[PDB]
Design a protein around this ligand. Structure first.
Ligand SMILES: CCCCCCCC(=O)OC[C@H](COP(=O)(O)O[C@@H]1[C@H](O)[C@H](OP(=O)(O)O)[C@@H](O)[C@H](OP(=O)(O)O)[C@H]1O)OC(=O)CCCCCCC
Ligand SMILES: CCCCCCCC(=O)OC[C@H](COP(=O)(O)O[C@@H]1[C@H](O)[C@H](OP(=O)(O)O)[C@@H](O)[C@H](OP(=O)(O)O)[C@H]1O)OC(=O)CCCCCCC
Ligand SMILES: CCCCCCCC(=O)OC[C@H](COP(=O)(O)O[C@@H]1[C@H](O)[C@H](OP(=O)(O)O)[C@@H](O)[C@H](OP(=O)(O)O)[C@H]1O)OC(=O)CCCCCCC
Ligand SMILES: CCCCCCCC(=O)OC[C@H](COP(=O)(O)O[C@@H]1[C@H](O)[C@H](OP(=O)(O)O)[C@@H](O)[C@H](OP(=O)(O)O)[C@H]1O)OC(=O)CCCCCCC
Ligand SMILES: CCCCCCCCCCCC
Ligand SMILES: CCCCCCCCCCCC
Lengths: 459, 459, 459, 459
């Protein structure tokens, strides 16, 4: 039993010397790195083109349908008078009706197909307002039933004006929306020698009055549905490569599962020979757990990628996350091979022995960090653009700790020095104390912990 | 006496083993953390909505009343000709008179109510100028009595033009102001299921000629007064939770005060048994001082929060500071529980033993920092936007020390290289010497001090 | 043989004491530093002027020929309607025809000279479209032969309108281009007392429809061909200095080659006397390899500079790279002289002994870095402007590691929090984990390695 | 002699115990710190107001006289067509003539007074062009005599149009300038209770054609001459405080000079008693050299400040530099008092013993830094806005070393990836290698040197 246990923990070179068995797993892992990386690169190159097509079409729609729109104004684009709102709505509808003769793109109309469109209707112009709304600020009185009523006007696309009678219920208006769909063909595909696919853009223009604040923001959003074109005509490798990736990962998974099973069996035998828990876990190869996880992630992502490229699936985000995480894991796995050489193993072991104390110090530091997050959010959120939400506060503080965006953070508060002196003084104390504590003490202690770990490894 | 003293300094686990008393204080502190954090989160979520409502209304007012206003121009918005100023004033008044038929919001006029409005007056247009002003730059002569005279024109809101005869005394003009109030109802409250409240915005538009420089900046400011609406009609938990918070903190305060009293009594007995000062202070639990302070802050802030939510108080800033500081303190207090475990206590003790030498080094560094602040303010303030005031200078230098906003600081001075060579050379010397000294020596010494403290703790 | 070997490894001072030979090489290296730096400075000063001339002319062309152009809009300048595109094209051609009477510069027309211009034609207006294109998004049908057909209209410059009949094939349009050349004389040369040279600017205006997305970007580019003017008349040192530089570097190269040859001969003799590889390499003077490389680079760059200044060559980039790299190398070579003094040699030796472990740690860190690069590119590239390409991803991550541009990176993802919650959560995990791992562990270990190297050198 | 030498090197407390002499110098230094800081603060507060007045007047002039000017366009404001240039010139002159009826400021005209104005002329409009200029780019021919001829038109201010016949020699034009003077009174002074002073603004508008590039930049500059108004009338402390400062610094200078003289005499006696150089220098009190320098600088700056405040001097820059440097020095001098306490002296001595090795390492690092500066300037200057000049290159590299403005530096080169692949690859290599070398090795070694100095001091 002792000889088998000694062989189990041998290095790959020692194992080969002892038994001369073929190191299939190592070469398989190298091939897996190569093929997984190539697949990720090809997938990303393909996806960037579709992203660009959708973005360009959406920008063109913003320039076509939003009255007075200019680049960079998305966050502040809003109406402020009744005539401005009416003009924006009518301009959007008129541009929709004039699209064939003015657009640089080639778009087809879509009619019907369920709500909010009636049969034969291409554009839906809907206003949503409270069922009953009486607002008398002069008497400080109001009587509102907050049930939302929707009233829609249906516009049919022109054959190649009732909507002008729209009357908005301003005092009880919740929002106005314009919905329509446009079909186009993505000719850009021919650059990559692909067959062009057929896009349906669902366009929603929102005039939002939920704040009831006298300012109505205006936005345009699109959702793209992609299909194979019914009759494509332009005067294999990808699917085969995906199959190769799947087979490689399946073989790797089988071999790693076999190794883990043998490890478990040897662990049980050794435990029996002795007639704790960490001693048992010493038999587990964490690198093989990592490889099995990467194999599962890659197989799932590749199946999803095959589905997406056939236009049967649209879950780009999940596929990308699976493939990217698996690629990260397989690239991290390379460190195992470096661990077999002493000069690299010393550094890897330095990090490994440092990690526990670093995590304990993180436990100590996290409570202070959270206290600062909450305090900053409650006090500075009303006045500081970077403190509006807790996640934003955490991002700001984390960036400050690493010496980024500090002066602008200080400068945003200079406007309130005369307005609210107490708030400005508190912000001074808060920012200075936080930055000093975290940069000059916490980071120094992280450096000291790593240095001590290195010293103990080297001696 | 020795047994009681030994029991006094026992850890909570040791205390429980020795006497098996109920650890009410510990569970109470955990509950306090939870409830205080929840209260802060709810208060912040409620306050953000009101902040947003006020901000949106103010932006809408800027777009409605300021001629030619656009987003982002607040700092530079100004008039430069007499006709520009007249047009801006008249546009503001005309928009005030036309508000009912053009605004997307629903506003009611307010009349009278004291100065600067007469009875029945909705808008006050006042010009302030020197009592006697004679300015003859051709003869380098002037005769001014700097007493300020105010002349106001009162405009009544329309029933649902004397102000056009305004004649500005340009050569002696101090400023022009437009004051008016608008009442509205905050319907947005219905999103959070709250009852809408009644807002009165006090709007002040200032055309400022204090510099007498040929450039007159124009600004709009608002102050919001919030009341319960007299007759609200929409087709408990908060107050009870605030009461629960107050009771929890009162119980914690009583227990901590009892512990501190027992500590004082034991200290007196021990001193008597011996028939210095720090030896006496060794009997004081600093964590309990922190807990008592947090309890007091939280109780005060919760009372103010109850007052504010009933529209009897408007001191949002003080309440927010109290609650945020108390939350920070209670979250910091968690470190006491970590001190009871050796592996975390080593790190906490490292920071504690480092602190004194760090403070002494800060004493050494502060005088150099202040000298640089004064020198930079006096020399570069005329030329550099980031050196206008001493607080701004301190913010700039502190950001530079942490590697932020450095290149822009250097680049601002590139314009003066040809204008004033001496100033540019001095700025080069100043910035390079400051940054090098503070980054490559001071920060390195902070790191060295922390490392030495860690080494001495570990050995 | 032992005495000769001892003399070979002696320091320059020891060598001079032993034999009193003239230290020609050292003084030659000092002179080389001086002359090479002076040559680089003069070359850069001369090149900046031509760069500025070309840039100013190009900006003027953008203002002259691009309808509605303004500074800062280069990246977003685009057309969105058919009439916008027609107006832009016609405006460019009309401005070309009106240039003599409106331009502030002095330009001459160029006719003929090969494609795309016919004989006597000054301007070429060409549209490129697919040979056969039928696109029916209504039926999800298309029939395209992607062979590109070019149709050009030739405009002759006016004597000191068929192009108005242009009909664009919008549905199959690939792009539109406008080509023309303008000749000018660079009078600015007189500032530096140089003789003005004759420029020919080749101007290309592109209206790009490759994306077929409804948005057509518009760009203007120039290529400058510089010649000696045929008959210049304005009412030596450079060539001589270049010759001096070449001679200095040739002498240095000869001396260094002699030293390397003697080193090789002594190495062979010592090997023979012993009747490994690194032992042999110990005889090689790396500083002399550096000096020989710098001499070769400088001689090549100086020949190219002579050719360029005579208008016989236009390879500015290669010449600049050669001269700059050689200057960097010669300035780096100064460290050799510092190595001869103990107090500087300790620091140099600290860096030298640290380098190997630093490189091994870089091997360990690079795989993690690459995994993060790939994962970030695939997942965040669709949503984040800084993750579009792999090189951009590497730049972003490298900047994040050094505490730059962090908050903006976090803020770019705040828009997708509501759109795609999964992507936003993944981005949070990705960014936080990457930054924490690389700043708080990797950089700390680099510091620890350098500190250990310094400690071992000092003891 | 031994007792006197021992007393000489005693600390102030030891000196007082030994002889009980009055420590006048110490209290005098404290008073000096106080009064010098107060003087600097008052001077800076006074200077900021004048700076603001001049800046506001200049901005108003830009809005008044520059056709189509808007804030933020100073760097790019330029003309591109002949009609644009004519319109800008005529608009400036017409606004000058209409100033009394349109300006919000109160300005008086200035006539005559030497060149460029004739007697009775308020505005001078001058074009400068080459004496002989023939430019024929069609034939690649030119004949230029570069002697500059100036032709001026004189406009008299209106009494409360020949300039319209201006014909510009475009092909030989060097520049166009408009010169005029405006007198105003600074009423803003009344805010600080000062007596208003009389300003004369000299306004120069330049249309610059030196590049001959088809783009003519337009700029406006002002120079302010300040006088006491002849007959001021508005319905001491500063001079007395300046005198007090001068007396305090004179007394401090006398005492420090006496101490230095006694040190020199004791050094000579000790040298004589022994019947090297650094041993002699050990007798010199560097803090007293610093105090003497600060006294001299403060006295000079205070005399200049007195002159300036009386309107007899206008050298604000030199006065500010003197006073700021003296304030910095006096604040730095406080460290001497901290050196007398052991716990602060250990840190001060750590920095002192670290300084030499840090300077030697700086010698080693500077040559590499300079090589990189030259290489980057020559190679990337044509393409990168941050590499235009050597000082700008140094600022950029220094900021990069400290982790600032890194991603934007990388991003500026992304445009040239397709244009010039070789340059982009070189920029990648250059930036990555520089940043890595300087952050991961050089800064780490600075940290190691400081840590070693601290360790040797502590042991
Ligand atoms: C659970 C399912 C298991 C499937 C695999 C069953 C086939 C099978 O045993 O192959 C042996 C080798 C294994 O290749 P590989 O895994 O590289 O080789 C093993 C490892 O070196 C292992 O060390 P660690 O990796 O450190 O644990 C070692 O203990 C084993 O020695 P031992 O056997 O004496 O205990 C080796 O056999 O593989 C091939 O030669 C490729 C052909 C694969 C054919 C499968 C086609 C699907
Ligand atoms: C000044 C006013 C005092 C008010 C409290 C008086 C009631 C009272 O003694 O309760 C005992 C425990 C204390 O709970 P708690 O404070 O957790 O328990 C004490 C701590 O463990 C203390 O250690 P340190 O915290 O390290 O100092 C220890 O020395 C005491 O032992 P000793 O007594 O033998 O000296 C413990 O009694 O509390 C309850 O069991 C909850 C019921 C609270 C009822 C109050 C309702 C308002
Ligand atoms: C391969 C072609 C070689 C060309 C040079 C042949 C002429 C020639 O030997 O000059 C001797 C000295 C060398 O000057 P230089 O190179 O400075 O001097 C040598 C170095 O000090 C060398 O040390 P390292 O540099 O550390 O290796 C040392 O070993 C040699 O001693 P040794 O000779 O006893 O072995 C020295 O002669 O140079 C002149 O005195 C300038 C006149 C140059 C005339 C060349 C005009 C073109
Ligand atoms: C070169 C011109 C010298 C002018 C000063 C001549 C007057 C004069 O000796 O005053 C003695 C003290 C000095 O005050 P102060 O300088 O503070 O005192 C001296 C320092 O403590 C000095 O130590 P270090 O500072 O470390 O070198 C020490 O060696 C001297 O002892 P010793 O004398 O036994 O050698 C002290 O006399 O000063 C006053 O009591 C104020 C009245 C100043 C009156 C001056 C009005 C203008
Ligand atoms: C052993 C205790 C020593 C305490 C030293 C504290 C020094 C405080 C200086 C604060 C400067 C900001
Ligand atoms: C023991 C004293 C040694 C002093 C060494 C100073 C070196 C100065 C170099 C300055 C480079 C900027």
């Amino acid at each position: 039993l002792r000889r088998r246990l000694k062989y189990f923990f041998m290095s790959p070179c020692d194992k080969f010397r002892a038994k001369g068995r073929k190191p299939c797993k190592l070469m398989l892992q190298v091939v897996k790195i190569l093929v997984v990386t190539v697949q990720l690169i090809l997938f990303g190159l393909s996806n960037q083109l579709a992203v660009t097509f959708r973005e360009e079409n959406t920008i063109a729609f913003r320039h076509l349908f939003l009255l007075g729109y200019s680049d960079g104004a998305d966050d502040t684009f809003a109406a402020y008078t009744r005539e401005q709102l009416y003009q924006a709505i009518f301009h959007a509808v008129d541009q929709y009706l004039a699209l064939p003769d003015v657009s640089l793109g080639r778009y087809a109309y879509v009619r019907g197909g369920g709500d909010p469109w009636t049969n034969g209707s291409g554009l839906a112009l809907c206003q949503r307002y409270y069922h009953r709304g009486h607002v008398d600020p002069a008497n400080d009185t109001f009587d509102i039933d907050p049930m939302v009523v929707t009233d829609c006007i249906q516009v049919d696309p022109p054959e190649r004006s009732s909507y002008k009678n729209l009357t908005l219920k301003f005092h009880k208006l919740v929002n106005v929306t314009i919905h329509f769909r446009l079909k186009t063909i993505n000719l850009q595909s021919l650059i990559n020698n692909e067959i062009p696919d057929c896009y349906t853009f669902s366009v929603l223009i929102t005039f939002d009055n939920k704040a009831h604040s006298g300012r109505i923001p205006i936005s345009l959003e699109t959702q793209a549905h992609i299909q194979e074109c019914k009759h494509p005509s332009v005067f294999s490798f990808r699917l085969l490569f995906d199959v190769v990736v799947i087979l490689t990962c399946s073989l790797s998974f089988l071999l790693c599962a076999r190794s883990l099973l043998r490890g478990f069996l040897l662990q049980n035998e050794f435990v029996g020979f002795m007639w704790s828990l960490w001693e048992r876990l010493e038999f587990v190869n964490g690198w093989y757990i990592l490889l099995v996880t990467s194999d599962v992630l890659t197989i799932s992502g590749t199946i999803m990628k095959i589905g997406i490229e056939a236009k049967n699936l649209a879950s780009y985000d999940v596929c990308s996350i699976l493939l990217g995480t698996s690629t990260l894991l397989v690239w991290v796995g390379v460190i195992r091979y470096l661990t077999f050489f002493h000069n690299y193993n010393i550094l890897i072991a330095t990090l490994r022995v440092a990690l526990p104390s670093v995590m304990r110090f993180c436990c100590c530091v996290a409570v202070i960090y959270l206290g600062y997050c909450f305090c900053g959010w409650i006090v500075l959120g009303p006045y500081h653009v970077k403190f509006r939400s807790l996640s934003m506060v955490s991002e700001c503080l984390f960036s400050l700790i690493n010496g980024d965006d500090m002066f602008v953070t200080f400068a945003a508060m200079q406007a309130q020095q005369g307005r609210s002196s107490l708030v400005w003084l508190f912000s001074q104390l808060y920012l200075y104390s936080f930055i000093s504590l975290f940069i000059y003490m916490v980071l120094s202690l992280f450096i000291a912990l790593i240095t001590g770990a290195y010293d103990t490894i080297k001696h």
